[PDB]
Paper text:
Icosahedral 3D reconstructions at 2.5 Å, 2.3 Å, and 3.5 Å resolution were obtained for I3-A6, I3-D12, and I3-A7, respectively, allowing us to build atomic models of each nanoparticle. Aligning two subunits across the designed interfaces revealed that these were designed with high accuracy, yielding alpha-carbon rmsds of 0.7 Å, 1.1 Å, and 1.5 Å, respectively. In each case, the rotameric states of the interdigitated hydrophobic side chains at the designed interfaces corresponded well with the design models, as did the polar residues lining the periphery of the I3-A6 and I3-D12 interfaces. Slight rigid body deviations between the building blocks added up to alpha-carbon rmsds of 1.6 Å, 2.2 Å, and 2.2 Å across the entire 60-subunit nanoparticle for I3-A6, I3-D12, and I3-A7, respectively. These values are comparable to those obtained from previous computational nanoparticle design campaigns that started from high-resolution crystal structures of the building blocks.
Here, we develop a general method for designing self-assembling proteins that uses predicted structures of oligomeric proteins from thermophilic organisms as building blocks. Of the 359 identified thermophilic trimer homologs, 191 yielded high-confidence AF2 predictions [predicted aligned error (pAE) < 5, predicted local distance difference test (pLDDT) > 90]. To evaluate the accuracy of our design method at high resolution, we used single-particle cryoelectron microscopy (cryo-EM) to determine the structures of one nanoparticle from each of the successful PDB seeds.
Author numbering:
A (entry chain V), B (entry chain P), C (entry chain T), D (entry chain 2), E (entry chain I), F (entry chain E): 1 to 16, 24 to 105, 114 to 142
């Protein structure tokens, strides 16, 4: 099984005590534990996220974990990108207790569980 | 006469039975029929569309056909880019029967006529 | 694919700056672009239009584009002629922003797009 | 860091397609990924859970994950056992979307995330 | 003292009689007068602005002047980028007399003073 | 281009941490930046301000920046002096967030921007 994790704008500035590299290592260590392959991606560009989602359709990704950051509350382009790949299961993640445009085009949401929310989302895709 | 056709985010995933390459062939074939030159462009980046609109002003484009996709419903930056080039006539196009921020800064809109909407828009710029 | 274009009374007096021969050249050029065969016909006689619609049924026309002119608002004979050939898809076209008796027996209407309305109608029959 | 996972009555009958041994392997694999030691325990006896909670106090467990099953809705004895060890952080977990007596004596609850809820709870204790 | 000036989308099309190169020369001349070092940046990409703000945090910039253009009215990503660097003082600028999402995360706003608004904003950071 | 800056009563006691000599150096440095000649004048006498405004008319000053201090709230003589030289553009400046008699006989007011308000006013006279 192959999983793709997508982080939106500003997420790389976690810790600015756990930082973004701590979250990446927790995700990569959990992937070995669950016996899955994982790719982790972050960008500040809305278009680079849409390109990464379109690349996932051509690369047989088995499921997607996404944290859009602030794009959750205004990016109808990322909503419609997630709607264009409806064959792939996706879970939306929020680190803090953040109405949203990307939720109804996803198979579930995890909110307010801190850095543990990604680990639930990966578990929900293995189930 | 030189026409520029601009496609917004997600439009390259048409048919994911007619697809995006079928639409490009229909536009390029119709340009020869109308005896005009055409450039067709697509990007998932909001800033690449604004760069392409600014490039058109320095390149003596005679008219613009634009399908913003989802940016129609939230991109005040693309609205104000179209407002900055008021000397050039533009037609907005929607493939499906989709309130919009980009409409009042254009000379017309074509809506819900499928892939035929681009062919009306090219005709309306020749007239 | 074979297309038939029918123009009603008075349409030959367009431009009495684009005239009727400009419209015929736009249609014939666009047909090569879309890789289709096209016949363009005009008459001032209501009965010659009904004869042309009956001829089309015996000639394996794949789709019809029609602009009835003023007959749109009173010719129940042309309505019932279009109803008699229900196996063939037809699009109704109006050049200017014109209740209509011929619309409910057609697969769609295109209105107020100038001479561009024929090009959308040909696109909608290829789709 | 040392974690203790406690499962209540009936939890060993999961899958009577994922079963209880699948959940134990997911937890043990995730523990290696997070670089923590884990003990996983299940019993049908209310008193054996209270003995295990009392043993944890003498064994320097750094955090507890607990799924009481039905005891959530009536066991004031397990509530008061969790209250007696207030120096140790605990997270409560429910597999399905199950008022509760054990919740207010814990640092958090995770509900309805399936077998993924344990993985969030371990993350929330590492954070 | 080191100052960073950020211009958003469309600002490079000022005067399409003073233009964007006049504004850059006024800012660079004023910086020598105030005895400060200045960097002036412009982009049409929302993500390139967020990258430039994140780069400023690693480069010990003493204060920021920002004119977001249209992003002022919808970019919650640029708002949250400005919030992520709260150690650095920022002034927001609007050339024309433009409710705004980026204002409450800045230490002041200058509005409707034309190209003079940048000179006040530099003064307010030297003070 | 020649600019005249007039400061009213009490302005020489700024900082009784930036003082009046700091403000004069900021103005003289900004004048070199904008490529303009500047004269800076201060007096506690209402009549010496009126003499300086009458001198400006005979010396072809291209624009005036004025901070009247408290004379803003009662000096109809300085108001009518500014009205007597309607051929010269003037900007009124207030350092702190101070109804006024001198405002309607000026081309604009700048208020509450600290010592930055003078630099905006010089920018507005070059524009």
């Amino acid at each position: 099984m192959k999983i793709l994790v997508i982080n939106g704008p500003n997420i790389n500035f976690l810790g600015i005590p756990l930082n973004y590299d701590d979250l990446v290592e927790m995700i990569k260590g959990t992937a070995k534990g669950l016996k899955v392959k994982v790719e982790v991606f972050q960008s500040n560009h809305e278009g680079a996220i849409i390109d990464k989602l379109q690349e996932a359709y051509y690369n047989d990704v088995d499921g997607i974990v996404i944290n859009p950051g602030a794009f959750t509350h205004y990016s109808y382009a990322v909503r419609d990108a997630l709607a264009s790949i409806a064959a792939i299961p996706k879970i939306e993640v929020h680190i803090s207790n953040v109405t949203s445009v990307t939720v109804p085009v996803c198979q579930g949401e995890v909110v307010g569980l801190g850095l543990g929310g990604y680990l639930a989302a990966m578990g929900m895709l293995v189930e």
